[PDB]
Design a protein around this nucleic acid. Structure first.
Length: 95
RNA sequence: AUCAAA
């Protein structure tokens, strides 16, 4: 299954545990007008899962970020930037 | 390793 949840949504893996949404809007907002930002975190420490997501208003403002910020760093920790895929903690059922 | 949303 090759799935990509529409242009403009990025996957931001390898982030610091100290990074949050404000740093993620502030850093990816440098490439395009953000419409949404995600930052994934532990449910007992509310830190970070070490990866996040962001939605741009243009599918190519996200390309310009995913062509600049990819392989760089956030809060001192090296990251990946790419078009986002769908989650994998859940699967189809019944039928 | 810079690997995916509870």
């Amino acid at each position: 299954m090759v799935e990509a949840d529409r242009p403009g949504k990025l996957f931001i893996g390898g982030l610091n545990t100290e990074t949050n949404e404000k740093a993620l809007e502030a850093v990816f907002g440098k490439y395009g007008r953000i419409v949404e930002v995600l930052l994934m975190k532990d449910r007992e420490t509310n830190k970070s899962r070490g990866f996040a997501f962001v939605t741009f208003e243009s599918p190519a403002d996200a390309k310009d970020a995913a062509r600049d910020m990819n392989g760089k760093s956030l809060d001192g920790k090296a990251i990946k930037v790419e078009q986002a895929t769908k989650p994998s903690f859940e699967s189809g059922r019944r039928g």
